[PDB]
Design a protein around this nucleic acid. Structure first.
Ligand SMILES: [Ca+2]
Ligand SMILES: [Ca+2]
Ligand SMILES: [Ca+2]
Ligand SMILES: [Ca+2]
Lengths: 220, 221
DNA sequence: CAGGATCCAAGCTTGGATCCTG
DNA sequence: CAGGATCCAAGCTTGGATCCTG
């Protein structure tokens, strides 16, 4: 079930490539919803089960004994990312003199097993296909880009400049809301340093960034 | 649902006095377990339902708008508390130089609606009676005793001396574990002032203290 | 188009407490 | 005896993400 080897995980990943959500859900005796409107994480959770990841786990990475993070990536009919990719929650407090090297973002993006999946709305959920895995490590350039955005976004957060934060900041990674709705709150830092109530935020990779990953892969 | 005034809450409390757990649960269409081994907070939830408090709620007081905390108190055949009373989780971190005046314990114990309930093991759960409420405010003496224990206990906590803490400390209030089991953990302060993983502790009123409240209630105090 | 808003699963934490072994 | 250990229910929070106006 849970792969004990990196070779095991990749082979298990190679083997589900080409399957439709219906076929895989069938094997795992997992019911398939009509669509993702009220099961937004169903596909990500489907792949976790098929690959041996623990459901609901809060570990730094899906496979801590391998140092591998698993992420599904919805792609459109032309091979382009359909959505941005959620990475992790931005620490709004207890962010003192935090460095990039020890960041959650870095930890989660150091080694990613990308599982591209069809996301086109015109295709019935049951029939969407699972693509071929892409075992990824950020290039020296990609990591410099991520680090730069992380530092810029974090400076904004640590300085209580949350009001100035928009999704438009960041070259390849951005901050957008991450919660139940626009009324969700978590502790943050105000304009004077007081601990305030604020909208929880998460780091997201932009579509251009993941599109670059898919492109480099195709070029191989 | 939620009482809007104090006379409403108190009249309702006085009206359920004398009912057995079975009669109350039946009224509420709530199933009654065989015993409390795997339903330790069942009686407490039962009273919350009957008095309009909210289930699952994590507010400081059960009835914040009224400034009242609801607490069942198990009593034996002779009228003596059967167990200590849980008050609240002791804050093991970010405890800085907080004072008793604005502590959770003081707040929670500023006004308590005690609902004594039969707890004798020889009485089938369904047949146990709910007693008459005791609407209590600590006397200067009681508050003084609590405050003293609170500070002595909080000192051990704030100075990273959790290793030294046992339930034997405190005159009327003590610290005992509070969690799933002895493997439960929450953040605390270690010997070097660093944040560590440690057993979650809770403030409990000793049986002598709640007994005092009951005794004072009978005497006419 | 895509920034801001929104939804589910399940582990985690808290509040309700009583249990149980020398 | 009673200190140390333990158990349920229900919010709360986090990891999985896609939805949806203007
Ligand atoms: Ca996971
Ligand atoms: Ca993952
Ligand atoms: Ca309550
Ligand atoms: Ca209560």
């Amino acid at each position: 079930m849970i792969p004990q080897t990196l070779e095991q995980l990749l082979s298990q990943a190679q083997s589900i490539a080409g399957l439709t959500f219906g076929e895989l859900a069938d094997e795992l005796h997992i019911p398939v919803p009509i669509d993702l409107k009220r099961d937004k994480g169903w596909v990500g959770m489907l792949l976790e089960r098929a690959l041996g990841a623990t459901a609901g786990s809060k570990a730094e990475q899906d496979f801590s004994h391998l140092g591998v993070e698993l992420k599904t990536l919805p792609i459109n009919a032309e091979g382009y990312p359909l959505e941005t990719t959620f990475v992790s929650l931005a620490p709004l407090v207890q962010n003192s003199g935090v460095k990039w090297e020890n960041s959650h973002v870095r930890h989660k993006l150091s080694c990613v097993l990308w599982m591209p999946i069809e996301g086109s709305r015109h295709i019935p959920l049951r029939e969407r296909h699972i693509g071929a895995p892409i075992f990824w490590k950020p290039t020296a350039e990609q990591e410099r880009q991520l680090k730069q955005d992380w530092e810029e976004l974090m400076d904004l957060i640590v300085l209580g400049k949350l009001d100035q934060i928009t999704a438009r900041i960041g070259e390849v990674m951005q901050l957008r809301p991450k919660g139940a709705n626009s009324r969700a709150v978590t502790k943050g830092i105000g304009k004077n340093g007081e601990i305030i109530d604020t909208l929880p935020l998460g780091f997201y990779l932009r579509k251009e960034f993941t599109a670059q990953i898919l492109n480099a892969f195709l070029e191989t």
